[PDB]
Amino acid sequence: EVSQDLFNQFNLFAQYSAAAYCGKNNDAPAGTNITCTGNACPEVEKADATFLYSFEDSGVGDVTGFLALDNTNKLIVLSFRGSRSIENWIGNLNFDLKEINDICSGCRGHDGFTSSWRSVADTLRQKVEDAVREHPDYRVVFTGHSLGGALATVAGADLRGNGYDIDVFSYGAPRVGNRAFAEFLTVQTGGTLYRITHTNDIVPRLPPREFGYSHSSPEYWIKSGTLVPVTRNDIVKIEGIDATGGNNQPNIPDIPAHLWYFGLIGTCL
Amino acid sequence: EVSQDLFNQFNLFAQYSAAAYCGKNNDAPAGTNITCTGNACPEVEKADATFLYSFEDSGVGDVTGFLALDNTNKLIVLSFRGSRSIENWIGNLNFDLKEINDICSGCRGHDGFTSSWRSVADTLRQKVEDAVREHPDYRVVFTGHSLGGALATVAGADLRGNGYDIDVFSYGAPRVGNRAFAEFLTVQTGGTLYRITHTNDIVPRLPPREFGYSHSSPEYWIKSGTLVPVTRNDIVKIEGIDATGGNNQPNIPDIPAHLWYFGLIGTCL
Ligand SMILES: *[C@@H]1O[C@H](CO)[C@@H](O)[C@H](O)[C@H]1NC(C)=O
Ligand SMILES: *[C@@H]1O[C@H](CO)[C@@H](O)[C@H](O)[C@H]1NC(C)=O
Ligand code: NA
Ligand code: NA
Ligand code: NA
Numbered sequence: 001e002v003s004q005d006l007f008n009q010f011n012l013f014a015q016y017s018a019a020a021y022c023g024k025n026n027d028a029p030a031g032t033n034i035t036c037t038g039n040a041c042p043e044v045e046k047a048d049a050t051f052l053y054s055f056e057d058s059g060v061g062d063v064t065g066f067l068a069l070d071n072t073n074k075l076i077v078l079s080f081r082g083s084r085s086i087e088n089w090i091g092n093l094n095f096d097l098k099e100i101n102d103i104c105s106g107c108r109g110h111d112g113f114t115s116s117w118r119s120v121a122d123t124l125r126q127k128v129e130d131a132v133r134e135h136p137d138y139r140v141v142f143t144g145h146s147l148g149g150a151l152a153t154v155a156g157a158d159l160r161g162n163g164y165d166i167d168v169f170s171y172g173a174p175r176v177g178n179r180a181f182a183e184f185l186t187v188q189t190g191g192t193l194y195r196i197t198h199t200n201d202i203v204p205r206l207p208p209r210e211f212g213y214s215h216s217s218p219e220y221w222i223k224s225g226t227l228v229p230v231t232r233n234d235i236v237k238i239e240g241i242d243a244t245g246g247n248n249q250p251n252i253p254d255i256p257a258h259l260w261y262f263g264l265i266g267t268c269l
Numbered sequence: 270e271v272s273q274d275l276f277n278q279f280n281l282f283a284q285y286s287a288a289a290y291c292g293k294n295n296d297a298p299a300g301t302n303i304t305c306t307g308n309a310c311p312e313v314e315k316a317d318a319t320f321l322y323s324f325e326d327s328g329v330g331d332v333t334g335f336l337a338l339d340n341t342n343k344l345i346v347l348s349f350r351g352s353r354s355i356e357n358w359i360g361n362l363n364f365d366l367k368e369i370n371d372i373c374s375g376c377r378g379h380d381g382f383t384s385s386w387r388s389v390a391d392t393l394r395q396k397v398e399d400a401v402r403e404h405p406d407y408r409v410v411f412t413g414h415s416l417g418g419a420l421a422t423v424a425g426a427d428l429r430g431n432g433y434d435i436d437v438f439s440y441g442a443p444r445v446g447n448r449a450f451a452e453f454l455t456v457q458t459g460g461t462l463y464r465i466t467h468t469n470d471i472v473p474r475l476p477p478r479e480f481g482y483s484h485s486s487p488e489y490w491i492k493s494g495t496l497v498p499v500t501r502n503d504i505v506k507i508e509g510i511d512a513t514g515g516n517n518q519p520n521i522p523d524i525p526a527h528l529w530y531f532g533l534i535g536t537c538l
Binding site: 040263 | 306307308309311494495496497498524525528529532533536538
């Protein structure tokens with residue numbers, strides 16, 4: 001029921017997110033073309049997409065990802081990588097909230113996600129803002145899978161309202177904060193959040209509701225199976241804060257579902 | 270190009286081969302229903318399929334796999350796993366040939382694959398023949414991916430001509446021996462060998478021709494990409510021993526192509 005155009009953008013930023021794991025970018029200098037192993041990001045590769053800045057283990061939270069310039073789609077893309085060990089990351093996630101009044105009043109955010117972003121926020125804002133000054137008609141997009149989707153969502157909330165819109169596309173993202181933060185991410189001006197979940201993926205059900213967490217609205221829930229191709233009629237737009245009957249269902253969730261967002265993600269063949 | 274029936278069998282044996290890696294078969298008792306993690310084998314789970322025998326690190330060559338009864342498809346399936354570390358195996362694979370005149374005259378086979386089979390041949394033959402003597406109507410199929418596909422091929426060549434057809438479905442198998450063995454596999458009565466390859470998969474390119482190896486004919490070559498769903502029209506039948514222009518083409522090969530045969534294989538989400 002989503003337009004072909006939105007389905008194509010969902011595909012594209014799933015592959016920018018996938019490229020944060022699989023991108024041939026160990027020491028890739030600025031200006032190198034973005035390429036991946038294992039057909040992880042073919043639509044990225046078709047674009048005129050280059051690395052503006054790569055980072056690995058940055059700040060106190062050891063944040064990894066890259067800033068890209070895409071002259072085909074006219075994008076400035078900040079892509080954050082999830083964990084290198086997702087099963088261990090999932091099973092060892094702490095659920096502590098901290099106040100984040102400097103992002104929204106009465107908002108509380110995951111201590112790790114919000115500390116990791118704060119630690120790199122000055123450096124990454126300046127990189128993004130340099131790119132925007134150079135290409136003021138390009139669209140700014142923040143994206144990521146898993147922990148990277150959390151970091152993208154926190155980053156977006158914090159850097160919006162500085163005269164360029166920031167759209168956020170997250171894939172399998174955990175809850176990032178309390179109901180006031182979910183409410184803020186629902187309504188915040190200056191950019192859209194496209195929060196994409198898949199079947200019974202455990203990560204978007206963590207941290208739990210009973211640790212004081214809430215999801216933002218809306219959710220774009222992929223109903224097609226693990227290792228199954230996604231069609232346009234497989235995505236369901238579900239409205240409402242902590243809406244049930246997309247990913248937030250009372251059934252038993254799984255980790256393989258987290259690794260399949262329009263193709264393989266969070267793991268590299 | 271192939272029939273819809275054969276396309277469905279291709280997909281089904283790809284999942285029996287995947288099950289050798291992702292099956293919940295760890296000291297699993299006989300009679301247990303076959304299930305996989307990570308949606309590896311949904312067609313196998315749909316079927317009334319159970320374990321007749323599991324084996325792990327069997328013989329000198331540490332051969333791993335299972336014998337399955339399938340009362341829906343009327344099958345007896347002997348599925349061999351490939352390596353637990355395929356990249357390590359590819360890198361460390363030696364090319365030594367050894368006399369197999371007891372299989373066919375003037376045939377030479379890979380030392381490791383033939384020795385690994387020979388070590389387990391008596392026990393597994395007994396298992397197969399117990400299933401045949403209980404279900405004489407059922408189709409005997411040997412299958413496997415990677416090293417498992419080579420073991421299924423050698424096992425087939427050895428055990429045919431004892432009163433039951435043995436069909437072999439191999440996925441990304443390496444060459445198994447010399448031109449004589451290749452010709453024997455092309456023409457051997459008592460079953461069909463379906464040797465399936467995918468795009469530029471590295472493993473069917475090993476050992477190299479230059480070490481005295483040939484492929485059997487024909488080859489079913491999948492020309493759809495890594496992480497792309499396979500259509501019936503995406504399989505080409507390629508005739509001739511050491512035919513070029515399926516997998517045997519002069520381009521750079523890669524490992525991810527090995528792990529995508531109708532779906533994920535050789536790794537478990
Ligand atoms: C880098 O991508 C650009 C734009 O797509 C292309 O013109 C150039 O050939 C690419 N570089 C290499 C080394 O392929
Ligand atoms: C085993 O599979 C059969 C049908 O294929 C079914 O009757 C039975 O419930 C299954 N066993 C379990 C433990 O689910
Ligand atoms: Na490119
Ligand atoms: Na908005
Ligand atoms: Na079953």
